[PDB]
Design a protein around this ligand. Structure first.
Ligand SMILES: CCCCCCCCCCCCCCCC(=O)O
Ligand SMILES: CCCCCCCCCCCCCCCC(=O)O
Ligand SMILES: [Fe+3]
Ligand SMILES: [Fe+3]
Ligand SMILES: [Fe+3]
Ligand SMILES: [Fe+3]
Ligand SMILES: [Mn+3]
Ligand SMILES: [Mn+3]
Lengths: 285, 285
């Protein structure tokens, strides 16, 4: 359907818009290129491992690789809906968001290829709770926006994508990676990538907070909606976290070898702390 | 609707895919930031001009500013459709395409603001032919892809966007800018931006060629469709070019002042040469 006019011909960009400022920061802090990461030491580390130790790291990489790919495809409807509402500054920022996610997909796929498991199908480490979030609830909530861009729909979309998938699972995943392999001195390439990813992610979560708050600010009843949608998803979050935990406890050999006391109680409490923390970044009033 | 699996969990990125290679080049050659361009000399140039000379440059800037904004919003459906067909490498590349266009919007809006015409509504320089292409035919052809992603639809979308708007109008616009203000020694900032834009644009046109050719390669009858859609739009292309030409001929004062012999016959023939050239980049066989 037609354009009825253009903001940068009638006027200019709104230079003070928060999403314009986030867009500017994204350009400044988003220069990194996964193609420049040296994975040669990672390949050696990985080949040095025994079959049992090799397996230990694959579940987390499988969750991240699919997750990056899901959110690369699934952010498009949000960019469309805000574009249709004429929110030009949001759209400019969302171009950096999508390009960040493309690079994240690229990074993990390069690591898989370099250590020699590209040919392996890592879908085996996706349980029913993971599928419910990433194969189903995420794409349902985003695609909805094509036909329903009400405040309710936009809140639910940002909640699932930015507050749960990024704000709870991704963040806890980054913490988990450092706690385990950074201590072990393993996989320097991959951890360089995790550091870059974790930096991009801060802007992604800030877009979600901004999006949810600006809708809550019009009607403080949407706040209840936010909390409700957070709680609906919690069972699948913790059901994926318990499942990974259980794989971790059964496959002890990497941890013994590298003298890592892998505190799964602490990882679990970090996930719980992330979830409650995101809730607190939205003010009812 | 659900994801039924993920390519970078089952396998890897297709590293040899042409769109993966274009994506890599885009990251390498796409570091430029419109926020780093120094427009201070442009502001002085523009204030130095008389009212008559000031006006001379505004029509081309109005066409570009709206055009950048249209294609930023209107590329989203192409990214969606190729994503739904599972063409991951195309999508990765299209994230760079969208981000390039965001920066193009940004660049012209910064120039308008810096020279002191942000508050002016430049819609006056969009005639009926321009509106037909940018306010109507472009968004119709792209949005169609949400409900119709047939080869016919995808060809028509790439033809209008990449071969006509970018491959014919944008390219001729870049040539026109250099021919006029680069000679005059005017607007150094803006011409730095035009150089960066013209570089990005090469990748954008290459995506269109690739997209159209890969569909022609399955069925050489789609070739006729391509040519037909090119010809349907030509009248509006030349009707916008004649209209700009006529504004240019009526408002002679910038050209006299700077000893520019502005050959509108040559600019017209460059537009015609662009259009025929794009046709030739698609092989029937
Ligand atoms: C043993 C403690 C378990 C910790 C939880 C691990 C979470 C795995 C993360 C998989 C999803 C990644 C989401 C990426 C989203 C994005 O790129 O914005
Ligand atoms: C006097 C000769 C006239 C020459 C033709 C001028 C064309 C003006 C261009 C306006 C549309 C710009 C399209 C931008 C598309 C993109 O950024 O990919
Ligand atoms: Fe993210
Ligand atoms: Fe369960
Ligand atoms: Fe372009
Ligand atoms: Fe006419
Ligand atoms: Mn990511
Ligand atoms: Mn452009």
């Amino acid at each position: 359907v037609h354009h009825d006019g253009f903001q940068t011909v009638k006027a200019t960009i709104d230079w003070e818009h928060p999403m314009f400022k986030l867009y500017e920061k994204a350009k400044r802090n988003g220069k990194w290129n996964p193609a420049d990461i040296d994975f040669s030491q990672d390949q050696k580390d990985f080949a040095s491992l025994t079959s049992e130790e090799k397996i230990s790291a694959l579940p987390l990489v499988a969750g991240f690789s699919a997750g990056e790919e899901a959110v690369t495809l699934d952010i498009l409807p949000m960019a469309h809906a805000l574009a249709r509402q004429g929110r030009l500054e949001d759209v400019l920022f969302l171009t950096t968001f999508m390009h960040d996610e493309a690079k994240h997909v690229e990074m993990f796929s390069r690591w898989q290829q370099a250590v020699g498991i590209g040919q392996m199908d890592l879908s085996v480490f996706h349980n029913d709770h993971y599928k419910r979030i990433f194969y189903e609830a995420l794409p349902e909530a985003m695609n909805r926006l094509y036909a329903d861009d009400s405040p309710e729909a936009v809140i639910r979309a940002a909640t699932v994508y930015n507050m749960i998938v990024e704000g709870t699972l991704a963040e806890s995943g980054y913490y988990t990676f450092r706690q385990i392999y950074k201590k072990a001195g393993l996989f320097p390439g991959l951890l360089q990538g995790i550091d870059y990813l974790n930096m991009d992610e801060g802007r992604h979560i800030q877009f979600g907070i901004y999006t949810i708050q600006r809708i809550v600010n019009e009607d403080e009843r949407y706040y209840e909606l936010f909390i409700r949608y957070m709680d609906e998803l919690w069972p699948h979050v913790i059901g994926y976290v318990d499942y990974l935990t259980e794989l971790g406890k059964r496959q002890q050999q990497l941890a013994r070898t590298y003298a890592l006391e892998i505190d799964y109680d602490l990882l679990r409490h970090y996930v719980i702390k992330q979830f409650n923390l995101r809730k607190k970044q939205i003010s009812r009033t």
